[PDB]
């Protein structure tokens, strides 16, 4: 009988949080930003098309020099591309073809991958031998790995379908911190610019803000009817965007703990696979399941433009760190660079 | 190549070497036959995995060869976290080998005593078969533990698992009725053929049945490619 009283106490605390959020809701973002002139028609153009994958491409990550691309496919190979010349720099054979995520190191020395094998494999690119070698295989998750990100060379944030999130140390090979509290499978990770916080998107329609140093959950977000597929931080680090299977993107405030804005259209009914921002933060780029990407005005909710030219489900969107180009990967086994 | 420097041209040559390696690996991979192994936990799929093999958690891959044809069997039993968020990865597979046991009807489910195990296997089969990703993918159904089913069916009638069933207590009639119900679960009768087999002690017979079903699937795919249909 203590369970019912404790549940009632939890309901009272949730009512307190809802009342606080309602009290802070002084104005709407759409009411404030009406004075801002719109961005107009943003017409981007394909400049480079990358070819060589044969199966479905699932993930891509940009380097910090805005020139190198890691791409992951169901062929069981990672491909490191040169974006300015379209040349292939590396082709890494994988021990398992069921890879759903990939990341590139900020230093550029390592590439990690993972998927249904429940193992996160980290590859050393800089060697005194002309072969990329498996540096470390990380194990301990029971569910499928959804996203992997690097805080630095020696630390990895890895989320999976066992509802948890693990911080990993390469040298020891043992997980240092385990983040728990999700009640559903975790699909995406967004890493803060200062590398002190990360936000996790899960199937239970709650996006949680985590502190990597402390190891405790500090903030929780809601308001999605369906599963959260992709999440991206705003450049300052005080807001983030969330994509879902409800054909809606939501801009959430980190400081006020509130849903700032909703991006939705009546004709669009298909789900969302990738979410990314521009360098300034004015254009939100989302890749949908009706085979195209939409560029949304972040502060006015208007559709700024449509990027199209893929023949199958758009899977992944990278924006360069200097903001020059947008790379789009999809299930037609092609990567397209847009400007 | 006039504007390109020497290191740029050598990078182009390295890229062409990588492209030829990718093309050869793709040509080698395309010939291999991929089979997705599904079923309940108590279905006894490990027995057939033992049989096919002759001739830590995650996807268990089994490579074998038969009549100069290479088969890759993918077992997803280890991960019970989700079924909706990764099964689209398996969209391009030649066939799904779905295994259920016939001795499951007397045994109730461990998690919930009220729910029967065979009905859980039927809901599993209905969800997998009527999935939007596998509209063209064939199913090879294996009915395991037929001897245990005979020993159970003599002691206990089938009326426990099926309320609305009037039929003779004969082993063949009961097995035929179970096969008929599993086939009736299919809602795609013009795009998806279901192949049913009763598992035998002999290793060769099950592999021969899988080889014949895969041959029929490849012939249907070639006929679709040619444009006769």
């Amino acid at each position, epitope marked *: 009988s203590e369970l019912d009283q404790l549940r009632q106490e939890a309901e009272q605390l949730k009512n307190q949080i809802r009342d606080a959020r309602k009290a802070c809701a002084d104005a709407t973002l759409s009411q404030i930003t009406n004075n801002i002139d719109p961005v107009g028609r943003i017409q981007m153009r394909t400049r480079r098309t990358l070819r060589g994958h044969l199966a479905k491409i699932y993930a891509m990550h940009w380097g910090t020099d805005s020139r190198l691309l890691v791409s992951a496919s169901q062929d069981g190979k990672l491909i490191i591309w040169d974006s300015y010349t379209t040349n292939k*720099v590396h082709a890494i054979p994988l021990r398992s073809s069921w890879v759903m995520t990939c990341a590139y190191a900020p230093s550029g020395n390592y590439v990690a991958c993972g998927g249904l094998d429940n193992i996160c494999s980290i590859y050393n690119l800089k060697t005194r031998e002309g072969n990329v070698r498996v540096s470390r295989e990380l194990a301990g998750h029971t569910g499928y790995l959804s996203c992997c990100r690097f805080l630095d060379d020696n630390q990895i944030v890895t989320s999976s379908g066992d509802t948890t999130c693990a911080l990993w140390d390469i040298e020891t090979g043992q997980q240092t911190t385990t983040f728990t509290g999700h009640t559903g499978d975790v699909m995406s990770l967004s890493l803060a610019p200062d590398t002190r916080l990360f936000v996790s998107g899960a199937c239970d329609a709650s996006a949680k803000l985590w502190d990597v140093r402390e190891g405790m959950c500090r903030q929780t977000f809601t308001g999605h009817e369906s599963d959260i597929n992709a999440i991206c931080f705003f450049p300052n680090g005080n807001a983030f965007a969330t994509g879902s299977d409800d054909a809606t993107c939501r801009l959430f405030d980190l400081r006020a703990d509130q849903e700032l804005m909703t991006y939705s259209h009546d004709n669009i009914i298909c789900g969302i696979t990738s979410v990314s921002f521009s360098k300034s933060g004015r254009l939100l780029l989302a890749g949908y399941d009706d085979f195209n990407c939409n560029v949304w005005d972040a502060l006015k909710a208007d559709r700024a433009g449509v990027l199209a030219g893929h023949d199958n489900r758009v899977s992944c969107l990278g924006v360069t760190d200097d903001g020059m180009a947008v790379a789009t990967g999809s299930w037609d086994s092609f990567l397209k660079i847009w400007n | 190549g006039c504007t390109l420097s*020497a290191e740029d041209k050598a990078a182009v040559e*390295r890229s062409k070497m990588i492209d030829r390696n990718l093309r050869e690996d793709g040509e080698k991979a395309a010939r291999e036959v991929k089979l997705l192994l599904l079923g309940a936990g108590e279905s006894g799929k490990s027995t057939i995995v033992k049989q096919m093999k002759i001739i830590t958690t995650g996807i268990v891959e089994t490579h074998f060869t038969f009549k100069d044809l290479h088969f890759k069997m993918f077992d997803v039993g280890a991960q019970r976290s989700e079924r909706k968020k990764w099964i689209h990865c398996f969209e391009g597979v030649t066939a799904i080998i779905f295994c259920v046991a016939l001795s499951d009807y007397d045994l109730v489910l461990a998690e919930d005593e009220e729910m029967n195990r065979m009905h859980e296997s039927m809901k599993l089969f209905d969800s997998i078969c009527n999935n939007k990703w596998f509209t063209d993918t064939s199913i090879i159904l294996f009915l395991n533990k037929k001897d245990l089913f005979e020993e159970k069916i003599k002691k206990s009638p089938l009326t426990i698992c099926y309320p609305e069933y009037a039929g003779s207590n004969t082993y063949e009639e009961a097995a035929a009725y179970i096969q008929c119900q599993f086939e009736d679960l299919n809602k795609r009768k013009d795009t998806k053929e279901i192949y049913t087999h009763f598992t035998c002690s002999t290793d060769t017979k099950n592999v021969q049945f899988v080889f014949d079903a895969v041959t029929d699937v490849i012939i249907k795919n070639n006929l679709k490619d040619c444009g006769l249909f």
Partner: single-chain antibody
Amino acid sequence: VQLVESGGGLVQPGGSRKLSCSASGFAFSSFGMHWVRQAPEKGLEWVAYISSGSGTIYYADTVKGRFTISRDDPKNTLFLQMTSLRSEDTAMYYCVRSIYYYGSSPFDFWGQGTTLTVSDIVMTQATSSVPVTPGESVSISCRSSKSLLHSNGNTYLYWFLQRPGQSPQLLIYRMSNLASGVPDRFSGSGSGTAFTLTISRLEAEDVGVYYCMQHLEYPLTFGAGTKLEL
């Protein structure tokens, strides 16, 4: 990482001699390979290049029609077949490893070389002898005959160190990068035709002959070499 050159010795003029280099400890099939020759007192001279896939082969103008390069990948060996040998061919023969992609560092590893005894962009490197007390920074100037700044912003300049009794070690590649395993004391800069190698805090290990190399276009040319005495 190891390269062992065999053969060598005393050859009568007009004879044919075969050099075999054995590669160990690395993936031989991915690297391009070079042959470099050093006379007893003269500077380094380029001889031949074979690609990783054996698709393109280049020879120096002097060695065309006499030297044949061959790449045996499953045995991890290089063969250089020599015919119509003459007095100039007498030299030390080094096998050089190279790798070519964006961000790579070719000319990284050098072999020990064999002694064979028989019985274009011009790189200017003037100051042969430099008498500076150790502990003071030294500049080394390498003038090029034409601009090495390509349209893609990369300037193709290489700085090598050959200390006495050892193989030439790579120090600086493309003038903005430092070779792996080399201390941060070495540095370099340039304007596209005039080039500067700056060495701070001279130690006893830095005694040797520095070399300047152009990689803009074939044939590859070397500088005369500056000698540092400490």
